[PDB]
Amino acid sequence: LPTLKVAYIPEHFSTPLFFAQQQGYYKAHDLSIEFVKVPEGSGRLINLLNSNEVDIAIGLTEAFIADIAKGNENIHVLDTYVKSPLLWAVSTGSNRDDVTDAKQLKRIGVSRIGSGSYVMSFVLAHQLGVPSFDQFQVLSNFKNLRDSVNLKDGVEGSDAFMWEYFTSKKYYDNHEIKQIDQIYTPWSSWVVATSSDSLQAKSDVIKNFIDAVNQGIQYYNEHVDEAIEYISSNLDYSAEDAKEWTKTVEFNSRIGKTPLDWDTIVVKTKDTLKLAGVLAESDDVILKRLNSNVKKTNLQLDGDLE
Numbered sequence: 645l646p647t648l649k650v651a652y653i654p655e656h657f658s659t660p661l662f663f664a665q666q667q668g669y670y671k672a673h674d675l676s677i678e679f680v681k682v683p684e685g686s687g688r689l690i691n692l693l694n695s696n697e698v699d700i701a702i703g704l705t706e707a708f709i710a711d712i713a714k715g716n717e718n719i720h721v722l723d724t725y726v727k728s729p730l731l732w733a734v735s736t737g738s739n740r741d742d743v744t745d746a747k748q749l750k751r752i753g754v755s756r757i758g759s760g761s762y763v764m765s766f767v768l769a770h771q772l773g774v775p776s777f778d779q780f781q782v783l784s785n786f787k788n789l790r791d792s793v794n795l796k797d798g799v800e801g802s803d804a805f806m807w808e809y810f811t812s813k814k815y816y817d818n819h820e821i822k823q824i825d826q827i828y829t830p831w832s833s834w835v836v837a838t839s840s841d842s843l844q845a846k847s848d849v850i851k852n853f854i855d856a857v858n859q860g861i862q863y864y865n866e867h868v869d870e871a872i873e874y875i876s877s878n879l880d881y882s883a884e885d886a887k888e889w890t891k892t893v894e895f896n897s898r899i900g901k902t903p904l905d906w907d908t909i910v911v912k913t914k915d916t917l918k919l920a921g922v923l924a925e926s927d928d929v930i931l932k933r934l935n936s937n938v939k940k941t942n943l944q945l946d947g948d949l950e
């Protein structure tokens with residue numbers, strides 16, 4: 645089977661991928677995997693796929709759904725990696741006595757326009773029963789977002805920003821920022837993606853990988869304690885946070901065995917992205933591009949007589 649270069653993100657979510665290697669599930673499926681650590685995020689994962697530098701990518705769902713719906717016909721969503729949604733925390737300055745809730749927010753801080761922190765602001769407003777926010781502050785990175793809400797020097801001030809909870813929890817504990825709200829993603833958090841080229845020339849090997857990921861997920865579910873020990877010893881998370889994290893996460897134990905949920909992966913995500921103004925194209929064209937790039941079935945091997 646062709647060599648597969650898998651671009652992943654060094655997070656607690658990548659735990660099953662690690663155990664699959666530890667238990668040698670990959671080699672068991674006759675696979676030669678070359679993992680490519682991508683701390684930059686899902687944004688770079690897509691770039692690595694488009695440049696043919698990697699065969700497979702595992703990142704946030706909304707990233708791959710948006711890119712496909714925006715025109716990129718070289719990206720394919722194969723299956724769901726994490727069935728449970730992502731928890732976004734709404735934060736502000738720890739000493740912002742003027743900001744006591746997510747109510748009456750004006751200046752919303754975001755890393756980039758069209759990013760997760762930006763798109764989720766529309767979900768926040770929707771659930772709050774208030775019009776979408778219009779004043780966005782681009783702070784580039786997470787570091788600046790905290791300084792912004794804290795009204796520190798070097799950056800423009802902002803009322804609040806959104807960021808993954810467990811990532812923000814560290815800064816709740818050190819009293820650098822405070823939580824004013826929490827919002828779940830309407831969709832499942834993580835998915836498995838590939839390129840048109842890798843899927844066309846390396847289909848069979850990709851299937852075995854997904855099955856290998858399936859066993860890795862099974863090992864995780866049957867060895868939570870070992871996963872906690874791994875995360876709090878190799879990743880940027882304490883034993884406590886790693887413990888609570890496992891209580892909120894549900895990997896797709898049916899990955900490769902059952903088609904992904906279209907409503908919870910495509911529909912809800914599409915509706916949100918369009919609400920955020922990320923998708924300017926018509927409904928028919930968007931849905932058309934999603935119907936051909938998002939798998940409605942699991943990968944299968946060709947027949948012997950074929």
Ligand SMILES: [Ca+2]
Pocket residue numbers: 739741
């Ligand atoms: Ca005070």
Ligand SMILES: [Cl-]
Pocket residue numbers: 715716717
């Ligand atoms: Cl196109």
